[PDB]
Amino acid sequence: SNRSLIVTTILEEPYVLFKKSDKPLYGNDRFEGYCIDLLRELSTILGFTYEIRLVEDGKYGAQDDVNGQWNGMVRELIDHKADLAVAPLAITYVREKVIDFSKPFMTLGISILYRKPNGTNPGVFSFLNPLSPDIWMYVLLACLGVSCVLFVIARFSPYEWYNPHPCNPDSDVVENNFTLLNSFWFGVGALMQQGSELMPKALSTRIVGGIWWFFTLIIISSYTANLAAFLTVERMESPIDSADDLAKQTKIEYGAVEDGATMTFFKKSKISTYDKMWAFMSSRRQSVLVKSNEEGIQRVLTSDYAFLMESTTIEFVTQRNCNLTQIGGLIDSKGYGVGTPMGSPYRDKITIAILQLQEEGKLHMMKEKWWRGNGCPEEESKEASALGVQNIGGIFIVLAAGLVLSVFVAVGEFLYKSKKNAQLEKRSFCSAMVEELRMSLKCQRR
Amino acid sequence: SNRSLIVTTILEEPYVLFKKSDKPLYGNDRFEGYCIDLLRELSTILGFTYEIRLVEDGKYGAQDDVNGQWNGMVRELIDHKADLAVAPLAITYVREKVIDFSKPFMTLGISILYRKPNGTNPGVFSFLNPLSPDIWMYVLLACLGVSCVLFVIARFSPYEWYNPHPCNPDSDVVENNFTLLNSFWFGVGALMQQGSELMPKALSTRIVGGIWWFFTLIIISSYTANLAAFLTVERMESPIDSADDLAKQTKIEYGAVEDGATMTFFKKSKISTYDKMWAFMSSRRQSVLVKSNEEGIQRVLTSDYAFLMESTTIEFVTQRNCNLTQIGGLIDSKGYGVGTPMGSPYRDKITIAILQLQEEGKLHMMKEKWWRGNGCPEEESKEASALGVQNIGGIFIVLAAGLVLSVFVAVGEFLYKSKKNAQLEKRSFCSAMVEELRMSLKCQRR
Amino acid sequence: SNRSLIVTTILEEPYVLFKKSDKPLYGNDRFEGYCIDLLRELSTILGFTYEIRLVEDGKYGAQDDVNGQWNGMVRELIDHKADLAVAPLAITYVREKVIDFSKPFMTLGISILYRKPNGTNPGVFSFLNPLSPDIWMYVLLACLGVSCVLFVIARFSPYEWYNPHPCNPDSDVVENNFTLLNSFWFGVGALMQQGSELMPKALSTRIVGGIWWFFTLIIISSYTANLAAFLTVERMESPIDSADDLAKQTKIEYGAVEDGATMTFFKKSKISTYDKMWAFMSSRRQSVLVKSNEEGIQRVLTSDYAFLMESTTIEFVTQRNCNLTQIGGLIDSKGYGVGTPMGSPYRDKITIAILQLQEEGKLHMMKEKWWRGNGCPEEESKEASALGVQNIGGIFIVLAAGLVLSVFVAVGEFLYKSKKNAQLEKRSFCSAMVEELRMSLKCQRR
Amino acid sequence: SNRSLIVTTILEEPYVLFKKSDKPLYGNDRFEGYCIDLLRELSTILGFTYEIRLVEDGKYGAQDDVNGQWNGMVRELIDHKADLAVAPLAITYVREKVIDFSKPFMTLGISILYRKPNGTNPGVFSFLNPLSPDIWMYVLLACLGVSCVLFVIARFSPYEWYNPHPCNPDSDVVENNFTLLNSFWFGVGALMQQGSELMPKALSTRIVGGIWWFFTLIIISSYTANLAAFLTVERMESPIDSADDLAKQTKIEYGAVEDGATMTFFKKSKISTYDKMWAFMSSRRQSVLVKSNEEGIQRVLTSDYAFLMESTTIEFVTQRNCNLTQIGGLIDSKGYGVGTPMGSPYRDKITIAILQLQEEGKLHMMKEKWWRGNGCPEEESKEASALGVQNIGGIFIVLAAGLVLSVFVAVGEFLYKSKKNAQLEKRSFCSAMVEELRMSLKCQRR
Ligand SMILES: CCCCCCCC/C=C/CCCCCCCC(=O)O[C@@H](COC(=O)CCCCCCCCCCCCCCC)COP(=O)([O-])OCC[N+](C)(C)C
Ligand SMILES: CCCCCCCC/C=C/CCCCCCCC(=O)O[C@@H](COC(=O)CCCCCCCCCCCCCCC)COP(=O)([O-])OCC[N+](C)(C)C
Ligand SMILES: CC(C)CCC[C@@H](C)[C@H]1CC[C@H]2[C@@H]3CC=C4C[C@@H](O)CC[C@]4(C)[C@H]3CC[C@]12C
Ligand SMILES: CC(C)CCC[C@@H](C)[C@H]1CC[C@H]2[C@@H]3CC=C4C[C@@H](O)CC[C@]4(C)[C@H]3CC[C@]12C
Ligand SMILES: CC(C)CCC[C@@H](C)[C@H]1CC[C@H]2[C@@H]3CC=C4C[C@@H](O)CC[C@]4(C)[C@H]3CC[C@]12C
Ligand SMILES: O=S1(=O)NCN(C2CC2)c2ccc(F)cc21
Ligand SMILES: O=S1(=O)NCN(C2CC2)c2ccc(F)cc21
Ligand SMILES: O=S1(=O)NCN(C2CC2)c2ccc(F)cc21
Ligand SMILES: O=S1(=O)NCN(C2CC2)c2ccc(F)cc21
Ligand SMILES: OC[C@H]1OC[C@@H](O)[C@@H](O)[C@@H]1O
Fold it and tell me: Which fold has domain D133-232?
């Protein structure tokens, strides 16, 4: 006998698919998928003929309170029109009574879907983060302002106007140090904690030094302390890693398909978490609470949703929307299972198969083929802890900018000297080149 | 099967909210909340029906006035126009004289509502917090210490006495570089880490400077390590922590409703703290007494104010917003209780009901239901803040303080020696113009 | 009529007490307490005669499953031997059926008892905490070791042995700087980040400088970083402040009296916390699970227990064992209530009293008298955040120790000079005193 | 009322623990745990009695050997000496061929057990972590940068050329203090903040040193801020994170039980990673295969090892101790299931039972019961550690590294110039003894 063992199916992608091609019939070759390749191996060992038949109305099905009158693949079966049923069916309490299931061939579970953490893009000039945008300006104003005072005070101070009485003292000349540019030098050097050569000696100049030196120490120790906070706090941040983490978070908000066995567990929950979580479900039962998985994928993209879903469909989209990720552990336990009529001469024959193919490893091999594919951009790390270029970075651009300006002035130094010198001395450029290569004089002489 | 049971009630959150849907009237589904959930478990354990009724005056109820009549739900409960009154009725003397309440289903006290600390203006100082004021003075005292001691040691020491003679040998002249003033300079300059000349010599000084330098480092490192911690972990404190703390203060105003529960108490109260506050409250009985609880909330948010109501409404307002909190504990004690006409057995019938329903745990479960909301805990590590004008401004102030002090001493210096010129020099204002125009030479020579 | 309204009582301290004195009868004056002073006021307003009578067997009482046959003050009442019952009785489900209670006169609750946080005793030398006890020794070994090398290297280095060619060069003498003591000076100064005067010039001496300067920077920046951790983490520590905090803590362990209405709530709990908490109760049901309150006080003293108790007895012992404290909020709700027989002509007369005395405030006034007393050592703060002497402290002792040693050497300097000088020069002490007061020479001359 | 029901069972935690009390035997109270709690809810929903039975061989059961007989509970379940077998029996092919299991009450996989990271030997370095290796090389490169550039700028600049003439005016000799070697010194010395002479001059140099000093501060402050964070927040990582990661390694040995569930799989497995490991495991089939799971645990604790068992026993061992953890996920998939003789209806009768009992939620509740223990989470902020020899030792190593490098260059210097003596001086070893004994003068003069 054949009977075709009238086998019900349901389009879900990956489990079964229309063949992706041209030409006609493909009769029982039309459908190609996991369940197809499973069915194949069921056929090899027990032996039978398979005529695929999509169910009508396309339903997993359930006992609808109106009349019961199961609405789907359960229905083609219970009336014994159907035979074996090889599709996502999700063993349950209520379905088991009326129709007896095989033993599982897959272990799914409820878990959360969320977008991957994008990155930081610190803004390579992150070093200039820990204080305001405004304070750095005023610190710059102060070094000019204070330095302007050192010039005025020191110059006007009779206790400055010391003498450059050398190592050989007892001559008589005065020669201040605190000219203008050297005044800024005291400011910039103190501000960077390396002490310049020039120093106050008269009290007035010493007071201003003593206070700038205070003005420095607080800014720097505060710069150090902020940056330790920004870095420590960042290090101290964990992403969400559980329903409990999401439970305490009235930020990134929940999501779920309408009843779809997902609300079902939550309504009938007794977990304090999943009881609390349900509160928000009911709360925004117009917004989040979507009515399809395809939207729930689309929705997490646009925004900060966390769609609850069976783990199998997580795995597929994760590996095909690498923007996105699984999170958490398997919340619940369930498992798909090939359907059989009320107690029949196949359930105990179809079950030994599933155990047989298991030991040989064909299922997990089959698990890879359909769900796995092109190697995702998995390459990604969070070793960010140790700082790198993207963290600090900019200071090297600041370094480069510095060295460049020194060149341009150093050229400017050359021109100004020889020109002003040549004004009272020889013509113009005779000086320039003889002065150029006498800087070169292969020794420190002249 | 008798009279259903006429339940009188008033609309007031989170007890009696007008049910939210368009889906027109349904009687026993025109209302929900806690007051309705209590009736459910009440009518479940017992057996009866509601239908429901409402007020026709708004008022909870009170001994009316000179008429000595009764308004509110106490009206309705006297002349048998109704029966049970699950509603926020507060058990009091005058009420119990004319009706008979049930036993409490919930406790209640008078407490405080204040704008939560936000620590968004610590002060234009608070670079100075990270060490105790006790320390900041002791260290300045120690700078005066070692400067005074370095002066003693160095001088009495023979080896400190170099002889300059840099350029040359002989010329047995002697010098002592450390003066008293020069000794501060080492002390102050070392403490701010910029370092100075007057590098010691002659071992007796070198122990001193070494231990000082060790004294410098620990203080700065300790200052730095703490400003890190205060800016990592914000233990944001609160101004007051009680009625007593609130009582002694006058910057903050008390607040209370008007002609009501809270107001009545403090008038009739006879405790010190609570008599003192009726005075302040009586003093301006036009601007610390709002005429509605909603506006009472407002005064806290916009102005500085600390409203006094019942503990339960606070807990509601507390959760919904995020900036309002329960400063202190429970001053008074009261209890809501289900109304009942005089003599009616429905008192004792409910009396066992509420006792029973608690031992189960439902009132607490019901409590968690309708009072909890968003749950707003944020506490998101205090996403670290760019240090700015507020958190440090005084370092700019001590700066401009010292700069002005430098000008005044500098003009001071100018006059002092210009008159010590006059000792050997000519009269007085000669030396003035001489040295004033000594600055007007405008070069690096005399 | 009188009847004495036979009033039952139970020795508990504070509620009722034997009078503390000599001479006999004191007939109904014997007992003195809260309930006594309450009863007093009940008598003033309703009017009656009171004959105290301690119950026999001394029991709150309960329906013992053996025979029911209530075992206590409930028993003297239900048989109508007794009358009013003014004592701690704790309104409940089961007691209410058989005997009808008045309305509460006290609002107790379950809460936790724990010892106060003692302190820190940081060990005043806490500055020397952040690194090991061992590393500081080796850093000290290194400054001697490295300095020993600078002497050897520099002295043996022909590029050192420069000339003290002064400001007037072109003479011919050599005069190293890096003698021994100045070598240590380079070490100690570099280690404290202030740069000494002496500097390497020859490469060999420059390499060792460059590496010590690295050896410094890591130690100090690590000293800073550890100390920021020890301080931050301490700041980041909260004490326990809830049953949930204690729930997550398999450290400081639970405690409770045997059944005593405390286990009762926990067994019949449905809170995930109080269900989890019960797990450990049952677990160590021989150790913690004490059989009396007096032990439970004694036990928390000895060790790290957290005895669960009704709030009233918390309040008393807290204010009389100031070592100890209340913690958490009221977990449960209950409330004492004067007992009355099955429905009787007093419950509705005794209840208006309790409400009457409330409004006048006599209860809370009475609440103070017995529970309050001698002002506890309440003076206590946790403003520890800003560091003070106890935190750092020691460095000032280190400072003092430094200055002292400098004196002793500075004396040693004086003796060594004049003696060695006087050896080739005048006698012994003629030099000493003429040298003493010529250091004084009121100017820097000689 | 029929046969009670003979339940065969094996003692194995946390399922079947011999009940703990002295209180001698009670049949149905000789045993408790999960296996017994399941029977409870099983016999409750159903109706029957246990009495109970045990094994008489110890073994769970297996196809015996050459005899082809059956031991264990599979013996007892064949020849109707018993009935249901609530016990940790694992559903497999050979078992299901001769009996008929129920449907799973729990899932199960093969996974890994490894000694939890303790981060108690980060390394004798890890003062070098807080910035990326990418950075530590770039900054040294920049020191070579600015030293080389300062050399260029300074020299070509006219104004850098001071003329010493300190003691005196004229003598128009010129100097250039910045050599190439002296330019490193500024660079290196500035970077370690000790500061140096060669303080620049002549503006073109001053921009360079300023930007360098700004480059110094950010790096040190960033280093300091991070070593704070790494020592505040210990994100202690793990060596491996999978079988693949474990597979490529050989420092760590795999581990597995022996002649059993786990071992059988990897032999019969045909996946790359799992074929590679049978090789290593086969290679030494005498020291990576313990002969008991208890000793298997041990090898992880004492030695370095990574044991392979079933996921459930791991979760048990995981909670009880605190140092053992579940590295990775679930390799295989299995499921425990209640035994039943062939054809018996008690399979399908229980089948609805387990489905029902889950939808309630009890199996999860039962799961939380007997697997959770102490719950050991400690994570007590990582009570901060006195930095020591481990966390920093390399700073002492780079020190002793450089000191040895200084001696070798120093002797290098000695020879080099001693032979540049010989140019003008006499032969070779003359200058040796001259300068060797030049050190033996033993004073500060030639
Ligand atoms: C980034 C790559 C460039 C690297 C720089 C290139 C190398 C720079 C040089 C390196 C050698 C070592 C440092 C300088 C000399 C040593 C000082 C001394 O002891 O005496 C010297 C005094 O001379 C000086 O002090 C200055 C020397 C430079 C003079 C003129 C510039 C030409 C150098 C090129 C600049 C190009 C600029 C590039 C333009 C694009 C005299 O030396 P001597 O009489 O010969 O014998 C003793 C010298 N001994 C120490 C070897 C024993
Ligand atoms: C802790 C409490 C002790 C405080 C110290 C006590 C006060 C110390 C003094 C303070 C005055 C200010 C500083 C020193 C003098 C100023 C320098 C100068 O310009 O010329 C002076 C050079 O003299 C010196 O440089 C050294 C002076 C001390 C010489 C001998 C020690 C006696 C001082 C006592 C030590 C006791 C040690 C204690 C023993 C237990 C010459 O001064 P003049 O020729 O007179 O006129 C110019 C001076 N004018 C600047 C005022 C205009
Ligand atoms: C010191 C001399 C050279 C002037 C330099 C400019 C500095 C000192 C000026 C410019 C901007 C100023 C600040 C502008 C605004 C505020 C906010 C105010 O609520 C307190 C003062 C404070 C914080 C000012 C303090 C002084 C300040 C920082
Ligand atoms: C540098 C010269 C002067 C010697 C000074 C002594 C210093 C450098 C010595 C004394 C103690 C030594 C340490 C003793 C123990 C250990 C632990 C070992 O697992 C690595 C080496 C290490 C960390 C040593 C490194 C060098 C050390 C720090
Ligand atoms: C690899 C080792 C052995 C050799 C490296 C060369 C070093 C050690 C030596 C060789 C000759 C030396 C130079 C020769 C003379 C002088 C002049 C002096 O006023 C300053 C130092 C200076 C400029 C020396 C600097 C260091 C120097 C460059
Ligand atoms: O004797 S009771 O009416 N029974 C329980 N209730 C409450 C539900 C809060 C309370 C709360 C406080 C009381 F003082 C008494 C009672
Ligand atoms: O309205 S009551 O029955 N009588 C007054 N009190 C008392 C503070 C004793 C309380 C305290 C709490 C209540 F819930 C009820 C009452
Ligand atoms: O269809 S089931 O027998 N019913 C539920 N169970 C579990 C209790 C874990 C599981 C767990 C994993 C499955 F694959 C199937 C089932
Ligand atoms: O012994 S089974 O009924 N058949 C084999 N399978 C798997 C498909 C993996 C599983 C997976 C998990 C189970 F709990 C049971 C089974
Ligand atoms: O048995 C405990 C283990 O830990 C200590 C170490 O010395 C090992 O040799 C030892 O075996």
Answer: Helix Hairpins (1.10.287)
Q: Which atom of ligand 5 is nearest to the CA of D415?
A: 3
Cβ-based contacts of B232 with chain D (< 8 Å): 232
Q: CATH for A135-167+175-236?
A: 1.10.287
CATH homologous superfamily of B17-108+334-370: Periplasmic binding protein-like II (3.40.190.10)
Quote the ligand 6 centre to A341 CA distance (angstroms). 58
* Pocket of ligand 3 contains residue A141 by CB under 6 Å: yes
The method of structure determination was: cryo-EM
CB contact under 8 A, C175 and D444: yes
Size of chain D, expressed as the number of residues it contains? 446
Tokens of B13: 């959150």
- Please report, as a single letter, which amino acid is at residue C182: N
Distance of CA B222 to the CA centre of its chain: 27
Question: Is B246:B305 a contact under the CB 8 Å cutoff?
Answer: no
Q: What is the CATH number of domain C135-236?
A: 1.10.287
Task: Say how far apart CA A244 and CA B340 lie, in whole Å.
Answer: 44
Is residue C440 in contact with ligand 2, taking CB distance under 6 Å? yes
Which amino acid, residue B317? V
Contact call for D417 and C203, based on CB within 8 A: no
Superfamily of domain D113-118+237-325: Periplasmic binding protein-like II (3.40.190.10)
Instruction: List, in order, residues 6 or more apart from A52 with CB less than 8 Å away.
Output: A7, A9, A28, A30, A31
State the chains in contact with A (3 or more Cβ–Cβ pairs under 8 Å): B, C, D
Q: Would you say the CATH fold of A135-167+175-236 matches that of A7-106+335-371?
A: no
Architecture of the domain defined by C7-106+335-371: 3-Layer(aba) Sandwich (3.40)
From B160, B149, B157, B217, select the one nearest B183 (Cα to Cα).
B149
Q: Quickly tell me which residue has 């400003």 as its tokens.
A: B227
- Residues 6 or more apart in contact with residue C167 via CB below 8 angstroms: A166, A167, A168, B166, B167, D164, D166, D167, D168
Residues of C in contact with A170 (CB under 8 A): none
* Distance between CA atoms of residues D181 and B115, nearest Å: 64
Contact between residue D22 and residue D357 where contact means Cβ atoms under 8 Å apart: no
- Distance of alpha carbon D10 from alpha carbon D85, whole angstroms: 9
Domain A113-117+239-327 - what CATH class? alpha beta
For a ligand 6 pocket test, name from C95, C110, C333 the mutation site with the most ligand atoms within 8 angstroms of its C-beta. Answer: C333
Tokens representing C168? 């007037």
Contact flag D384-C149 (C-beta cutoff 8 Å) = no
Using the 8-state DSSP alphabet, how is residue A117 labeled?
Answer: P
Q: Which of A413, B445, A403 is closest to D202 using CA atoms?
A: A413
Buried b (16+ CB within 10 A) or exposed e, C62-90: beeeeeeebbbbbbbbbeeebbbbbbbbb
Which stretches within C195-261 are classed as H helix?
Answer: 203-236, 243-247
CATH class label, B133-166+173-232: mainly alpha
Please tell me the class of the B240-325 domain.
alpha beta
**For residue D343, how many other CB atoms are within 10 A of its CB?**
8
Measured CA to CA, the distance from residue D183 to residue D160 in angstroms comes to 13
Q: Which tokens go with B236?
A: 């944001």
**Domain spans in chain C, listed from the N-terminal domain onward:** 7-106+335-371, 113-117+239-327, 135-236, 394-436
Distance CA(B268)–CA(B146), nearest Å, equals 64
Rg for chain C, CA atoms, rounded = 40
Residue C164 φ/ψ region, left for φ over 0, alpha for ψ in the -120 to 50 degree band, beta for the rest: alpha
Give the span between the Cα atoms of A182 and A147, in whole angstroms: 9
**Which residues make beta-bridge pairs with C53?**
C8
As a whole number of angstroms, the distance between CA D20 and CA C181 comes to 75
Q: Looking at beta carbons, which pairs linking C362-365 to residues 24 or more positions away fall under 8 Å?
A: C362/C41, C363/C38, C363/C105, C363/C106, C364/B271, C365/B271
Cβ atoms of B333 and B107 within 8 Å: the answer is yes
* Distances in whole angstroms, Cα of residue B130 to Cα of each of A212, A222, B50, B63, C258: 20, 11, 64, 59, 49
